[PDB]
Design a protein around this ligand. Sequence first.
Ligand SMILES: N[C@@H](Cc1c[nH]c[nH+]1)C(=O)O
Length: 231
Amino acid sequence: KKVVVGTDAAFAPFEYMQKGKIVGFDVDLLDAVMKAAGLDYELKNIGWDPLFASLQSKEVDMGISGITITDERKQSYDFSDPYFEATQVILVKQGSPVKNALDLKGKTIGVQNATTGQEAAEKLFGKGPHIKKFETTVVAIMELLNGGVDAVITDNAVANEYVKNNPNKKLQVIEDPKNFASEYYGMIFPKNSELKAKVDEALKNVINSGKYTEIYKKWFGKEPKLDRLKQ
Ligand SMILES: N[C@@H](Cc1c[nH]c[nH+]1)C(=O)O
């Protein structure tokens, strides 16, 4: 019996489809972690909202989908030790007047459904019509390109990856460290999972052996500050 791992492979550089195969930082880290934990696994591309549903039903044993550790998600799920630090940013067209998150007032914001980016947008301007929720971040960014939304709030490394990969779209990343707090990714599990402890120990092995850093350098071209993982 293999471990069923779910991911939403529409979140580059962490997980995405390349020539019909699921690739990314989370994909490479998962492979490293699971082999260090001695667990045969299957990686499923399932979708963002199906994934969380599947984890609650326990049909999926494990998740790695650039998922931010939050106390709101700790209600139903368990998390591994953090393996990445992120923050929400604001993605816009280069000609945007947006300088900070407060400039987004009265404007339409495209977020992926049930994410920390949605939460951040709803924290500032409350729940309402000009917060447009999409199943993938890919589609949210697509509503930005065509003018359907004025701004996108998503994770920083994803936004930076899209700007880097797509210069002809002429998008810019607006950072607001005053409004957006530090976030940490964790591998997710159904409540009281027996895999969590094995994954935590395997992650340490992966970090200690220098395996994590090689994967980090591959996707981000620089040395990680590993002290971000002991916060
Ligand atoms: N890290 C954010 C955004 C995200 C990760 N994967 C898809 N969206 C979250 O877990 O809510």
